[PDB]
Amino acid sequence: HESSERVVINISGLRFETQLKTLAQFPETLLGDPKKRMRYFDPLRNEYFFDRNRPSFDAILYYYQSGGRLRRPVNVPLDIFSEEIRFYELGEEAMEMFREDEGYEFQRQVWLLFEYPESSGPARIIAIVSVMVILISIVSFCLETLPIFTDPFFIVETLCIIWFSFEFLVRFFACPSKAGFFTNIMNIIDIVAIIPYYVTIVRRVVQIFRIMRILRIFKLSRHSKGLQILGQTLKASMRELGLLIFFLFIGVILFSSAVYFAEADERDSQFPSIPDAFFWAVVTMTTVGYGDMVPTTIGGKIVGSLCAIAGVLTIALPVPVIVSNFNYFYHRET
């Protein structure tokens, strides 16, 4: 009991040696409780024997020596080291920190088919129809603006919205906490996909509410794991995502002004002002190269060359970070 008396721990032939005050620091563990560890004592050698994994005990003993630092060694498998922590009984408060450091009736029945579709057969069949109603609604939306086009795009627009409403209503009543119902951004999409039609019953407003009829494409996120992974990626990459927008903003203003002063004293110049040369810089840095406007002078072609070179660089800098973020959520979701 905190007395500098020395204790020898033998792990499958690997000899460990520490003070009793070090093990008495955590009395709830195996080596810390004199009653739990005595089952492993060897009175012929004055040591405790364990017929278990050897590379793991380095961190187990150091967990006592450091006072709580539980770090898996770089050569010990994750499943093996985690099973050793449960044997020596380090505790759930210590096991949780190891996982954090490692990176880790009638109402309930109708709630399963309209939320967890893998719960049963008929629960997943509804997910098929809930997808067909999205694809048909997307198809009908694009075929409205066709130059060719009772009103045959109102039978479908209203048949695609009786599902969008009847399905949204059940999820609002079969839900437990109505106050935490709006935290899930996946149901605000279900609302923004019913706001336009139900409010259509100043020209700027009728146009924008027609735009909000394009967010329905996000309703596929409920039935697509890939869109979910994409959402978590951008949400965790806002720094390098906005960093790309900022590096473009500097490159646009820089190279739009550079091509303007090199293509300003020309009758055949296509750069009348700096803002007009903005789109040229964006399509040149992104290597899109529409061809709707291209420099003609010597200095204009020099700026155009450096605009394409600096474009592929300033874009490829924050891309691998976003790609690595995506591969994390994608490989983890298995």
Binders of K ion among residues 276 to 315 (CB under 5 A) are: 287, 289, 291
Q: Three-state DSSP class for 298? A: helix
Q: Which is nearer to K ion, 43 or 291 (CB)?
A: 291
Closest to 222 in 3D by CA, of 173, 180, 164: 164
Contact code string over 69-108 relative to a copy of itself, x by CB under 8 A: x-x-xxx-x--x----------------------------
What per-residue string of b and e applies to 263-275 under the rule 16 or more CB within 10 Å gives b? beeeeebbbeeee
- Taking the complex as a whole, how short is the minimal distance between the CB of residue 1 and a copy of itself, in angstroms? 17
Distance CA 330, CA 334 (A): 8
Q: Which stretch binds a copy of itself (CB under 8 A): 64-72, 96-104, 126-134, 164-172?
A: 64-72
Q: Compute how many residues bind a copy of itself; rule: CB under 8 A.
A: 100
Helix (H) or strand (E) holding 15: strand 14-19
Please calculate the CA angle 162-191-231 and round it to the nearest 5 degrees. Answer: 120
Residues 8-27 that bind a copy of itself (CB under 8 A): 8-10, 12-13, 15-19, 22
Q: At what angle do helices 78-87 and 57-66 cross, to 10 degrees?
A: 60
Distance CA 24, CA 67 (A): 11
253 touching a copy of itself, by CB under 8 A: yes
**β-sheet bridge partners, residue 9:** 16, 48
**β-sheet bridge partners, residue 311:** none
Residues 34-53 that bind a copy of itself (CB under 8 A): 49, 51-53
Q: Which is nearer to K ion, 79 or 292 (CB)?
A: 292
Q: Which is nearer to a copy of itself, 121 or 291 (CB)?
A: 291
Distance CA 127, CA 189 (A): 17
Amino acid at 110: V
Residues 171-230 that bind K ion (CB under 5 A): none
- Taking the complex as a whole, how short is the minimal distance between the CB of residue 282 and K ion, in angstroms? 13
Residues 198-227 that bind a copy of itself (CB under 8 A): 207, 210-211, 214, 217, 220, 224, 226-227
Residue 110 binds what, of K ion, a copy of itself, none (CB under 5 to 8 Å, by partner type)? none
Residues 267-286 that bind a copy of itself (CB under 8 A): 272-275, 278-279, 282-284, 286
Out of 2, 54, 86, 183, the only residue in the binding site for a copy of itself (CB under 8 A) is: 54
For residue 228, what are its two tokens?
Answer: 């979910």
Residues 283-312 that bind a copy of itself (CB under 8 A): 283-284, 286-292, 294, 301, 304-305, 308-309, 311-312
Distance CA 76, CA 81 (A): 6
Query: By the criterion CB under 5 A, which residues form the site for K ion?
Result: 287, 289, 291
